[PDB]
Amino acid sequence: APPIMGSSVYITVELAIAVLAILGNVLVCWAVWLNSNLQNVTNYFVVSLAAADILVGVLAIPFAITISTGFCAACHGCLFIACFVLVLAQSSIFSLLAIAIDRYIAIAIPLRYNGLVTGTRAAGIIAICWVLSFAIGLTPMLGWNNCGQPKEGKAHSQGCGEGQVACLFEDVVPMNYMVYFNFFACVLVPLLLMLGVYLRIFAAARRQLADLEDNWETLNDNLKVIEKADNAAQVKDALTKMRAAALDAQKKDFRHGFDILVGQIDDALKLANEGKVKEAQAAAEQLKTTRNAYIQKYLERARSTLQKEVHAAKSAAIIAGLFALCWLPLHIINCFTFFCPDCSHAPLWLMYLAIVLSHTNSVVNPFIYAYRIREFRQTFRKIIRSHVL
Ligand SMILES: CC(C)CCC[C@@H](C)[C@H]1CC[C@H]2[C@@H]3CC=C4C[C@@H](O)CC[C@]4(C)[C@H]3CC[C@]12C
Numbered sequence: 240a241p242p243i244m245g246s247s248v249y250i251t252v253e254l255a256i257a258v259l260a261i262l263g264n265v266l267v268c269w270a271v272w273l274n275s276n277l278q279n280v281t282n283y284f285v286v287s288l289a290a291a292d293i294l295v296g297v298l299a300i301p302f303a304i305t306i307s308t309g310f311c312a313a314c315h316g317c318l319f320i321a322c323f324v325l326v327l328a329q330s331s332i333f334s335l336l337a338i339a340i341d342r343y344i345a346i347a348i349p350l351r352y353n354g355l356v357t358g359t360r361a362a363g364i365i366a367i368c369w370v371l372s373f374a375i376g377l378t379p380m381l382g383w384n385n386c387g388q389p390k391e392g393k394a395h396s397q398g399c400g401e402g403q404v405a406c407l408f409e410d411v412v413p414m415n416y417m418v419y420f421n422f423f424a425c426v427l428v429p430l431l432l433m434l435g436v437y438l439r440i441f442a443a444a445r446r447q448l449a450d451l452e453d454n455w456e457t458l459n460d461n462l463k464v465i466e467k468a469d470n471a472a473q474v475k476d477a478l479t480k481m482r483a484a485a486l487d488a489q490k491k492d493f494r495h496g497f498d499i500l501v502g503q504i505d506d507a508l509k510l511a512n513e514g515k516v517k518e519a520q521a522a523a524e525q526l527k528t529t530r531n532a533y534i535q536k537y538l539e540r541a542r543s544t545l546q547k548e549v550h551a552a553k554s555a556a557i558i559a560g561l562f563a564l565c566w567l568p569l570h571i572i573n574c575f576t577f578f579c580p581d582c583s584h585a586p587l588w589l590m591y592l593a594i595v596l597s598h599t600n601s602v603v604n605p606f607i608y609a610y611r612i613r614e615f616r617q618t619f620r621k622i623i624r625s626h627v628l
């Protein structure tokens with residue numbers, strides 16, 4: 240079978256993926272530049288992620304096509320072509336980790352968020368992560384490689400010049416680097432951390448919603464205790480529990496409804512301590528009207544805000560999960576190649592499928608923003624309509 244036939248299918252699919260990765264991710268960068276509502280710290284890591292996916296199409300995919308032919312080259316030039324995609328993958332992992340951490344600070348410590356994370360600190364984090372991605376991804380160029388033990392029967396068979404090798408990924412890149420150092424330490428470990436962070440995000444959002452409902456019930460229940468009461472101290476008990484639940488839900492038109500709320504509680508408590516119970520019970524049914532006009536409005540707005548952040552955290556978790564789905568097959572195949580020297584090597588068509596799948600990850604993110612983030616979707620339309628004209 241002419242190898243150029245099967246090679247044509249692999250090359251054609253890769254070029255198709257490159258065009259889509261470039262187009263969709265250029266659109267993401269254009270949206271963030273145009274719409275000032277999208278220019279926040281979270282979306283700067285989105286742009287950093289988009290830039291890495293753009294470079295997959297412009298450089299990594301052409302590099303992959305080149306190395307599939309086994310052309311003769313100087314071994315260290317082959318190493319750079321083979322290892323550059325590892326830089327872009329490491330950059331993606333760092334950007335995903337930052338987005339998870341940024342979303343956790345937003346829900347856990349919302350008050351200091353705007354003081355903690357700033358636009359100028361995010362840019363410096365992004366630059367540091369990119370430098371580290373080059374260091375991790377190009378570590379084979381520092382000596383941990385197979386350039387010292389060339390396959391010379393292959394180089395002679397392909398007619399390579401002196402000092403050249405047949406440029407093949409598994410011939411120059413050691414598999415102990417790929418498995419122990421790249422997969423376990425630099426990919427799997429950061430992915431598990433992301434898993435734990437998102438676990439803390441959804442647990443903390445659940446507890447906050449429950450606390451709000453508990454205070455809402457604590458307020459309403461102790462109101463009925465007052466109505467159907469008989470002694471002055473019972474009135475005092477129910478009221479004091481309301482004052483605590485009133486201050487533990489305060490964490491300007493809201494401050495009014497809370498200024499009134501704590502005020503009416505204070506009036507009714509003074510009546511009970513003096514002993515006038517009937518006057519206290521009646522000074523309480525006014526607390527009702529306060530809740531049906533101010534408190535319930537706050538409880539709804541706070542509840543609607545929390546759900547908006549959970550939605551935004553769910554969207555980021557889908558992006559991280561799709562990364563794992565597209566990259567794990569290739570990594571798992573490397574484990575079989577490395578750990579089972581008695582097993583037959585995975586066939587070539589499966590290698591190409593796992594490689595293509597890892598490249599598909601650079602296409603999917605712009606579809607997630609359009610489906611799940613309304614501000615992205617509207618901005619997308621505006622660009623397409625005003626430039627398809
Ligand atoms: C800024 C961007 C567009 C520049 C892209 C630079 C790329 C195309 C260059 C930089 C380093 C180059 C490599 C350096 C050394 C060798 C070894 C030689 O025996 C074959 C060519 C090969 C493998 C080169 C291929 C092209 C290469 C990868």
Ligand SMILES: CC(C)CCC[C@@H](C)[C@H]1CC[C@H]2[C@@H]3CC=C4C[C@@H](O)CC[C@]4(C)[C@H]3CC[C@]12C
Nearest residue numbers: 564567568569571572575582583584585586589
């Ligand atoms: C990450 C999710 C989608 C799971 C993916 C599992 C894939 C990558 C697994 C499941 C079955 C696996 C195959 C099972 C058996 C063999 C035969 C062996 O001689 C070479 C490896 C090879 C060919 C494995 C390659 C990896 C493989 C295809």
Ligand SMILES: CC(C)CCC[C@@H](C)[C@H]1CC[C@H]2[C@@H]3CC=C4C[C@@H](O)CC[C@]4(C)[C@H]3CC[C@]12C
Nearest residue numbers: 427567570571572574575576577578579580582
């Ligand atoms: C969260 C999950 C994805 C963690 C990753 C699981 C990986 C590290 C596990 C799952 C399946 C495992 C493989 C299953 C079977 C064998 C065959 C044996 O002869 C050598 C080890 C080898 C090849 C294992 C290597 C490690 C392996 C690839």
Ligand SMILES: CCn1c(=O)c2c(nc(/C=C/c3ccc(O)c(O)c3)n2C)n(CC)c1=O
Nearest residue numbers: 303306324408409417569573587590594597
């Ligand atoms: C994520 C890193 N990474 C890899 O880990 C990888 C790989 N290409 C191979 C393997 C190729 C191959 C194997 C056996 C063959 O007979 C053959 O002809 C080709 N691997 C193991 N790419 C390059 C496209 C890659 O990006």
Ligand SMILES: CCCCCCCC/C=C\CCCCCCCC(=O)O
Nearest residue numbers: 296297298301304305308309310311
């Ligand atoms: C937007 C800029 C894109 C730059 C890349 C342009 C397209 C590159 C396509 C594939 C180049 C493959 C080169 C062939 C390798 C040498 C073949 C061989 O020696 O057998």
Ligand code: NA
Nearest residue numbers: 291292331601
């Ligand atoms: Na990516």
